[PDB]
Amino acid sequence: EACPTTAIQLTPDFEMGEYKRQDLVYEKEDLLISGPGKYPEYNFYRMAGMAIDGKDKGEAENEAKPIDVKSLLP
Amino acid sequence: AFELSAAEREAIEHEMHHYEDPRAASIEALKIVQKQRGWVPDGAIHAIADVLGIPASDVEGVATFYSQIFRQPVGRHVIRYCDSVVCHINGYQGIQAALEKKLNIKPGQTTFDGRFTLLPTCCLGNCDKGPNMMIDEDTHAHLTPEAIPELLERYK
Amino acid sequence: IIRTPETHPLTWRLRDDKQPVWLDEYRSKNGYEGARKALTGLSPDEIVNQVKDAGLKGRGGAGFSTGLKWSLMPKDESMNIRYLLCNADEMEPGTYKDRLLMEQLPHLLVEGMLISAFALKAYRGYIFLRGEYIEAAVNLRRAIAEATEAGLLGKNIMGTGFDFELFVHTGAGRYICGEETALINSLEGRRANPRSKPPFPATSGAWGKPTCVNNVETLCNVPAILANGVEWYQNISKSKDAGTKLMGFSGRVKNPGLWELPFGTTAREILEDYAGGMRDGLKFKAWQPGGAGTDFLTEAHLDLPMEFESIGKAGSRLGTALAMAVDHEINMVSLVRNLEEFFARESCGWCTPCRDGLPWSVKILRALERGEGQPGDIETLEQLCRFLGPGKTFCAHAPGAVEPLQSAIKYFREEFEAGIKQPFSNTHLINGIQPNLLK
Amino acid sequence: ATIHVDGKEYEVNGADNLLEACLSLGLDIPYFCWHPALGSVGACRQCAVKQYQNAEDTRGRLVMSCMTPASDGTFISIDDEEAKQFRESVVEWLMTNHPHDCPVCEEGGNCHLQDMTVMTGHSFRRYRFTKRTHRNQDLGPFISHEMNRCIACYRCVRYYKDYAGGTDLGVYGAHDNVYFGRPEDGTLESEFSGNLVEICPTGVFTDKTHSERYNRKWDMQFAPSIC
Numbered sequence: 091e092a093c094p095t096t097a098i099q100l101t102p103d104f105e106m107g108e109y110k111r112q113d114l115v116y117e118k119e120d121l122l123i124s125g126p127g128k129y130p131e132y133n134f135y136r137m138a139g140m141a142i143d144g145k146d147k148g149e150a151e152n153e154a155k156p157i158d159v160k161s162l163l164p
Numbered sequence: 165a166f167e168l169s170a171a172e173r174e175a176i177e178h179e180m181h182h183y184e185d186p187r188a189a190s191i192e193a194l195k196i197v198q199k200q201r202g203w204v205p206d207g208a209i210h211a212i213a214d215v216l217g218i219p220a221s222d223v224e225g226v227a228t229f230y231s232q233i234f235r236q237p238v239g240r241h242v243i244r245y246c247d248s249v250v251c252h253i254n255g256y257q258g259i260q261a262a263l264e265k266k267l268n269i270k271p272g273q274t275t276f277d278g279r280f281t282l283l284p285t286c287c288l289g290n291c292d293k294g295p296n297m298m299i300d301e302d303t304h305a306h307l308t309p310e311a312i313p314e315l316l317e318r319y320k
Numbered sequence: 321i322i323r324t325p326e327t328h329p330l331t332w333r334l335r336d337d338k339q340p341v342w343l344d345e346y347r348s349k350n351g352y353e354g355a356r357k358a359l360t361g362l363s364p365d366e367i368v369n370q371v372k373d374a375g376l377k378g379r380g381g382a383g384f385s386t387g388l389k390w391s392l393m394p395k396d397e398s399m400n401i402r403y404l405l406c407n408a409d410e411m412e413p414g415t416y417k418d419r420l421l422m423e424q425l426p427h428l429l430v431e432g433m434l435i436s437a438f439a440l441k442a443y444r445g446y447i448f449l450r451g452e453y454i455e456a457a458v459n460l461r462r463a464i465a466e467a468t469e470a471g472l473l474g475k476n477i478m479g480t481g482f483d484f485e486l487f488v489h490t491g492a493g494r495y496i497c498g499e500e501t502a503l504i505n506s507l508e509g510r511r512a513n514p515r516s517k518p519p520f521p522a523t524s525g526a527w528g529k530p531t532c533v534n535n536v537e538t539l540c541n542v543p544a545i546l547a548n549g550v551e552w553y554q555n556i557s558k559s560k561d562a563g564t565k566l567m568g569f570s571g572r573v574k575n576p577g578l579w580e581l582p583f584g585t586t587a588r589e590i591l592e593d594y595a596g597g598m599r600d601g602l603k604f605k606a607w608q609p610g611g612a613g614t615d616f617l618t619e620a621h622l623d624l625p626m627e628f629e630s631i632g633k634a635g636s637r638l639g640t641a642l643a644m645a646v647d648h649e650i651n652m653v654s655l656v657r658n659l660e661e662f663f664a665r666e667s668c669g670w671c672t673p674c675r676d677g678l679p680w681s682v683k684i685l686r687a688l689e690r691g692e693g694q695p696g697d698i699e700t701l702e703q704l705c706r707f708l709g710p711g712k713t714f715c716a717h718a719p720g721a722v723e724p725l726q727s728a729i730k731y732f733r734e735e736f737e738a739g740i741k742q743p744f745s746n747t748h749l750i751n752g753i754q755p756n757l758l759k
Numbered sequence: 760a761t762i763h764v765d766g767k768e769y770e771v772n773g774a775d776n777l778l779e780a781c782l783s784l785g786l787d788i789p790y791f792c793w794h795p796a797l798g799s800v801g802a803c804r805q806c807a808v809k810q811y812q813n814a815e816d817t818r819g820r821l822v823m824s825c826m827t828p829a830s831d832g833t834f835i836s837i838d839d840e841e842a843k844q845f846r847e848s849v850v851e852w853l854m855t856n857h858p859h860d861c862p863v864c865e866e867g868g869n870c871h872l873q874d875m876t877v878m879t880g881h882s883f884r885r886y887r888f889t890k891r892t893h894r895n896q897d898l899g900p901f902i903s904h905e906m907n908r909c910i911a912c913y914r915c916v917r918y919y920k921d922y923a924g925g926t927d928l929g930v931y932g933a934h935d936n937v938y939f940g941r942p943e944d945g946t947l948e949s950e951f952s953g954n955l956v957e958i959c960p961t962g963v964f965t966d967k968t969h970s971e972r973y974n975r976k977w978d979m980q981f982a983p984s985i986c
């Protein structure tokens with residue numbers, strides 16, 4: 091409910107019993123599945139304003155291209 | 165690199181004589197550089213800052229604040245058509261469409277050969293004679309879309 | 321129509337070939353006699369009293385009294401470095417009067433500088449002129465050179481001992497520079513952000529010194545008052561606004577132009593006598609009394625005198641009294657879209673309501689133009705008009721920006737409602753999340 | 760002096776403005792452009808209260824509490840409906856162009872703009888148009904620059920130029936394309952440039968050294984220490 095990227099999800103799976111209590115500490119490779127899970131299309135970085143690879147400034151949703159202050163338009 | 169000429173520096177100093185603060189000649193120094201070079205390049209900001217004794221951030225803020233100080237390269241002639249309300253009533257849209265069709269550019273852009281740069285401007289104070297358009301030094305009034313090619317031809 | 325010096329104190333010495341009147345011709349047509357009388361027989365305080373008693377109001381659009389503005393100057397003799405500034409910016413759309421009065425009668429402006437600077441004890445004067453008035457700048461510089469050659473400017477003017485130097489400062493093309501405190505900031509070579517008041521420019525203005533900013537037309541009204549007296553100026557019109565005013569209609573009329581008329585002249589009188597009415601096949605729809613920053617008025621308001629209180633009580637401002645006539649075929653949404661685009665690009669960016677609320681209105685008006693308006697857009701425009709009023713924003717640019725919008729919404733709401741043609745959608749459906757269906 | 764806020768009487772210093780006087784008493788007024796050390800300029804228009812002329816006044820007038828002196832016998836209202844609506848409108852206007860960046864923003868959980876968006880009670884977005892964007896500068900090893908998050912409150916330039924005496928950070932541009940930063944890419948030359956990470960109420964100027972090994976403020980173990 092807290093996740094703003096829909097990254098963390100609770101799956102319909104319950105068989106998680108273990109022999110050692112230390113083996114119930116799941117690291118990132120034990121959690122990161124290879125697909126989108128319950129939310130199949132949401133991409134936070136498609137909405138965020140911060141620039142990453144493949145998505146420059148002004149390429150997010152509802153964003154205009156940046157206008158330089160040196161531009162000739164009034 | 166950039167270097168102010170002697171004439172530019174003399175004009176800037178003579179403008180500095182007219183005010184009790186040398187900062188007050190920043191607009192006129194930018195306009196002097198713009199008259200001599202068509203626009204204000206990047207080194208001109210630091211040169212004017214060194215002459216006036218004010219930070220380059222202040223000169224850059226003045227240069228980017230005012231619309232008629234060009235911080236990007238322009239063409240040989242700056243077409244400035246009035247897009248304000250009285251010229252809107254008098255139909256500047258025909259003038260803008262004629263200029264776009266003749267020059268094959270969008271407003272704010274420059275032609276391939278650097279001849280004209282198309283810009284909308286504010287009200288030119290000639291509303292009773294609209295639509296008006298100010299090329300480099302001359303204001304042209306009572307404009308019609310069929311008189312645009314005959315008016316642009318005299319500006320080589 | 322003939323123009324006698326008694327009823328046309330600003331335009332009687334104009335020439336029929338639209339050529340400037342130089343120093344010899346100006347002196348032949350009763351030139352610098354008000355300046356001579358003021359500088360050879362009058363104290364500065366009694367000149368300020370004469371201006372205040374003549375009821376000279378400001379011609380820049382605010383309509384404030386000039387004598388009361390000059391009376392705000394300090395009485396201390398220690399502050400002797402004082403400045404007179406001329407708002408020759410004239411950047412308001414629909415205004416074309418100061419261009420005429422400076423291209424054709426520059427020595428009237430120079431004489432007004434002389435008298436007003438002597439009255440204010442102002443040692444320096446600057447004409448803050450826009451950079452698009454090349455001919456006006458050339459004529460003003462030539463007039464200043466001629467007056468310096470004749471001994472009317474510089475040191476020891478006419479043997480009085482009053483030293484006054486006059487400069488022409490060409491602007492760099494920004495509308496907000498017309499605001500007087502922003503004019504002071506742009507004169508100092510800064511970004512033309514306006515200043516909060518108090519303190520007024522009369523206490524600490526240009527470079528912290530006492531500084532009075534006046535319009536071109538006010539300083540051109542000054543020499544007639546000093547030459548022909550106070551009771552003559554009070555007896556020009558039988559109205560509460562004394563003196564004459566440069567009025568005129570523009571836009572789709574038969575004879576768009578500028579004429580000097582006494583206050584109290586109705587706008588229908590100007591339209592149907594001097595402008596000649598609308599052109600062929602055009603029905604008169606609306607009119608702005610005082611330029612781009614004034615409320616629209618309908619044809620029912622056309623029978624109204626062009627005074628400050630009469631236009632103000634109708635729900636508008638007199639402004640520069642240069643009216644613009646809008647005919648029937650002009651779409652109100654497109655006109656207000658153009659106006660708001662101007663006002664939102666000529667913002668100075670200082671304060672949040674103008675800077676971030678005028679572009680929102682611009683985008684809403686673009687959507688209403690394209691038929692892509694959504695429900696709640698007109699309510700957003702109305703709330704913007706209520707929240708950009710006087711005192712909400714840092715200067716008076718945004719109230720003058722929202723006056724045409726609210727007036728066009730008041731009188732032409734059907735077109736704005738006709739702009740709304742699609743349902744309100746702010747979100748998109750995310751696959752996996754059920755939306756909160758608000759009612 | 761004596762001020763009457765929402766029908767309650769308080770004794771405040773008369774040399775203070777209304778915003779700092781009411782904040783000293785514990786009254787919550789949102790503010791962006793004002794800072795205690797920088798003075799009052801009245802830019803952001805966020806500190807609006809309703810000032811009445813006297814006790815038996817009903818209309819009032821919206822004023823900026825940072826620009827209004829705390830004179831004797833001053834009647835104001837903070838929680839009036841018109842003042843609350845105007846303050847929420849100012850927050851909304853700041854939110855129209857603000858990027859969708861809080862998860863990936865170093866000021867998240869530490870952001871004055873977040874706190875004032877929540878405090879004015881603005882949580883429903885009805886703006887549907889494009890947001891203006893900006894390109895960032897490289898300000899050196901210490902200060903990271905992200906101009907999208909700017910609310911144009913002029914705190915950075917006022918501190919860096921008027922207070923700190925620096926010369927290489929200004930405001931450039933116009934109407935709503937105002938930009939804050941250096942005239943070119945380069946290191947900020949002030950010895951006190953790092954105070955921008957706390958002067959800026961948004962995530963424009965952030966601690967790059969903290970950003971390389973980042974955690975939120977609620978995860979920090981703090982202590983009072985001496986440099």
Ligand SMILES: Cc1cc2nc3c(=O)[nH]c(=O)nc-3n(C[C@H](O)[C@H](O)[C@H](O)COP(=O)(O)O)c2cc1C
Nearest residue numbers: 378379380407409410411498499500534535716717
């Ligand atoms: C946004 C704005 C633009 C203005 N532009 C001008 C202008 O272009 N010319 C002018 O004379 N006054 C302009 N004014 C009015 C001035 O603030 C001031 O009232 C005037 O220049 C001098 O006052 P006066 O009428 O007593 O002479 C403008 C005011 C505002 C708020």
Ligand code: SF4
Nearest residue numbers: 668669670671674715
């Ligand atoms: S209303 Fe505000 S942002 Fe707009 S021009 Fe005036 S001070 Fe500048």
Ligand code: SF4
Nearest residue numbers: 860861864870961962
């Ligand atoms: S500056 Fe504040 S409101 Fe903006 S993205 Fe960062 S945390 Fe969110």
Ligand code: SF4
Nearest residue numbers: 909910912913915959
């Ligand atoms: S960069 Fe930060 S401190 Fe500067 S104006 Fe923008 S929000 Fe304010």
Ligand code: FES
Nearest residue numbers: 246287288290291
């Ligand atoms: S509206 Fe175009 S010249 Fe004034």
Ligand code: FES
Nearest residue numbers: 792801804806825
């Ligand atoms: S805090 Fe008062 S207007 Fe910004």
